[model samples]
Target: PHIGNYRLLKTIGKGNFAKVKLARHILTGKEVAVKIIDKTQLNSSSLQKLFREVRIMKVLNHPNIVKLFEVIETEKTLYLVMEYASGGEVFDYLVAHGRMKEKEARAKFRQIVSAVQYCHQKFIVHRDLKAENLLLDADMNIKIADFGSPPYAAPELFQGKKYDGPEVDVWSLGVILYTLVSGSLPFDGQNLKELRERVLRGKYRIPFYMSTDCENLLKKFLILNPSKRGTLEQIMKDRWMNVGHEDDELKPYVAPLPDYKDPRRTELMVSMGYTREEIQDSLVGQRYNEVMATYLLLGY
Candidate 1:
C-alpha cells in the first residue's frame, strides 16, 4: 500500500480499530513501523480523540520514547509512522521467561524508570504503561510506546477524573516491575470492571512471599491517592532497584540472560501458546491469594 513516498512491507500487528505494518522509506530504504486507522469506521469523536493522541505523540521526543516520524491523513485512513523497534514488545519477553532474576530485573526497571522520568520532565504522561506498550530494541533497551491517555496534569487538577497525571503512569510502572519479578499482577479482580475498581481504590495488597524491598516498592506505587505515590525519581533512588553494590550477593539469585539479539532472524520465534483466558486466570489466582494472605496477616 502507498503511504507518502513509502511502501508497506508487511503486516506487523493489528487490533480491532487499528493495524500496524512494517514499512520502508521509498528513497532511503529505512525501516519504520506505521499504524493505520480507518477513519470511516471511527465516529467523529473517536477520530478527533485519535488525532489528539497522535498530536501528543508528535510533541514527545526522548530516547526512551518511541519516535513519531510522520502523520498522514487520507479520506479513508489515518497513518502514524514511527521508529521501528525490532525486539518487539516487552510483554513477550516477560511471558517467555516467566520471571527475571533480581539483578536483571533491576537493570530493566532502571531503563524503564529513566524513560518514564524523561517523559515526566517533558510534561507528558504515559497514562497506559504496561509491558505490551513498552518496546525493546535489539539490545533490550526500552522505548515507551502508546499515549492514548491524557497528558500530565497537577494532582488537584486531575481530581475526580480517570486520568491521574504522572502518578498513574508511575503506578503502571510499579505494576510492570512487579510482574517482571513475580510473573504476576499485584492485584486481580473477577473482571475488568472489578479489576479497574480495585486498582482505583488501591484495594489490593502485596504478599509475604515477596521480598521486603519488593513489597516496599509495590506499596509506594499502589497508593489510593495518586498525589501521594512515589515519583519516578523516588523509585530510581530506592535501594531495591540499586543492586550494583550487591552484585556479588545477588549473583546467585539473579542470572543474566545472554545479550538480547534478533530472535526472529534465527527462526526462534516459537509461540508460547498462552491463551488470554489462561493469563487472566493466572493473574486472578495470584491476586486472590495475595489479598487473602495479606488480610489474614493484618486482620483487616
Candidate 2:
C-alpha cells in the first residue's frame, strides 16, 4: 500500500504491535524505513507510549540518531517514515566477527556517545541501551535506536533503587565498551537471578591486555553508586575515548530550508501540486504534511 509518497515494500522488521517496512519515495526514489503501527490493536496506555516515542523522535535531529521524517495517521494505522539505516545491528556484527580492535571500536563508540549526549542535553535519557539497539548506516556510522541488555543496566536499575537518568546510560556505555574491546560482557550469569546479583554488586573484571586509559574509563562507568558513575561529558572527554578523533563535533542543527534552485525541488513543485511558497511555509513553520515531507525528502 502507498502511504503518502512512499510505496511500501517488503517487511524489514516486526515487533509485538508494529511492523517496519522498506519503502521508496515515489517523488525522489529514496528508500526509507516506515514503521507501521496498528492503532486498532493499541490500548490507551500503549497509544500514549506510541505518541511519546513520536514526540521525542520528532524533535531530535542528529546525525547519529535515527531520523524521523514524518508521521502519518489514518483510520487503521500510524506510519512513521524514518531515515533508512542499511548496515544492520552492532550485535549481529560482533556475533559474526568476534571483537573489534580498540581503534575501530573507539570510532564507533564516539558516534554512540555523541548521540547519547545529544539526547541527554535535550533532557532525555535512554533507559534501554545495548549493542543490539545500536545500528550502523551505509557509512558505518552508529545510529542509536528503542535505544538492552541486563548486562548493560546500571547497578541502581538492577537493585530497584531510585536514580538519576544519564547515569544508567553511562553504565550501559561501559558494558558496550567492554563488549566491543573484549568480545565479552563484564558481568554475565547463568540466569536472571545471577545476573541481577552480579549487577547489584557491580563486580566485573576488565581484560588485562586492554590499555590503562581504557580500563580507567571502564572503571569510572561501572561504579555501583549512580552518582559516582561516569557522566556523559566525562565519557565523551575521556582520554581513551578522545584518542585521534578529538576534533569530531556535531554540526549545528538547522531546519531543512528548501533550496528552490535545486532541480528536484522544482520537479516536485510541478508534480506534487505544491507551490514554492506553500512548501517554504510548511517547512519553516515545522508543520509536517505530505507536501512538506516531499519537499524535505528532496535534497536541501
Candidate 3:
C-alpha cells in the first residue's frame, strides 16, 4: 500500500509498461499520481524511452504540462511521482460532452499552445498530439501527457522523409484544433492506405459554424508543406487564439523565473521537516527529491 513516502491508494490508469496509482505524500498529505514501472519487463528500446521521458520531464516546468515531482527506483521497479490531474483525459471529456463551444475551445487551446510553445522554445517537440494525450487538471486546465504517441502523424512520416520536428508538432496541433471545435476528425479513412492519402493531400472541410479567423488559422496549420505551415509564434499571434487573451495575451512563450524563494512555500516545506536551506537549495538547484517534491506539492 505504501512506497517510500507515498501511500498508493488505488490504480488510476495504465500504460504499455506502467501502472498509475493514486497516491498521497505522507508528510504533506497531498495527492499525487505515481507511475509504477516494472524495469524487468522493459526491453532495451522501451527502457531508453522511459529514461528519455524522465530526463525531458525533469527540465520542463510549464504550468500546463504535467509535473514530475520525484523518481524512486529499486532493482525491480521505478516510481514516477507526478502532479495529479483530477479532471482526467480530454478524450473522456469530449466523449461525454461532445464538441466544445468556440469560446471554451479557444481558452483550452490557448493553454495547450502556451505549454507547447514553451517546449518548442527548448527544442522539445511533442511528436504526439491527440485528445488522449491532453489531460485536464482539477481546475479544468490542460495538462499535456505522453509526450510521444500519436495517430495524428505528420505527412512527412508517411513519406519517409526528414522533417522539421516543430513543424510536425504544428500539423498535429491543426488536427487537435479541428477535433476540438468540430466534434469530429478532419481526416479519416477506412485503412492506412486511405488515411495516408487523406493526410498527404491535406484536404479537410471546414465547418460552416467556424469563424473566419479560426478557419484561416487551421488552413495555415494543415498545410501540405511543412516549411510553410503556421509556426507556434504565428499561432500565438493569430486573431482567433487571442480572442479572450486580454490580460497577459498569449505571446511567444518564455520560461518564467523559478520562485524558489516564495516564503509561503518555503515555510510549508520547513514545517514538513525540511530545513529552509534545504528547501531553497533543492528547489533553486532543481533537485528532484522529497524536499523539492514537498515544495512543488505546495502548488509551486
The most accurate candidate by lDDT is 3
TM-scores of the candidates in the order shown: 0.70, 0.90, 0.93
Kindly list the per-residue Cα lDDT of model 2 for residues 113-216, writing each as its tens digit.
87887788888888788887889999999987753467787778766798567888888888999999888898889998899988888777867778888888
Per-residue lDDT of candidate 3, residues 1-300 (tens digit): 888889899999887799999998887788899999999999999999888898888999888999899988789898989988999888788778988889999989998988888898989987877788899998999999865233488899889887667998898888989989888888788787888888888898888898998898888788877787877987788888888776766886567777888898877677767798888888877778878887777773
Worst 10 residues of 3 by lDDT: 145-154
Higher-ranked by lDDT: 1 or 2: 2
Candidate 2 has an lDDT of: 0.81
* lDDT (tens digit, per residue) of candidate 1 on 1-300: 876746899999898779999998653456778899988888888878797788677556566677676667779988877778898877788788777777777777777887777778777776667767778877888887777122112222234666657887877777777777877675565665555555555554554456788767767776767678877776766778765755532111122332222233212112333343443443344322222112111221
Q: Which of the two candidates, 1 or 2, achieves a greater TM-score against the reference?
A: 2
Candidate 1 lDDT score at position 249: 26
Clashing pairs in 1: none
* Model 3: residue 5 alpha-carbon error in angstroms: 1.2
What do the candidate models score in CA lDDT, each in turn? 0.65, 0.81, 0.85
Ranking by TM-score: 3, 2, 1
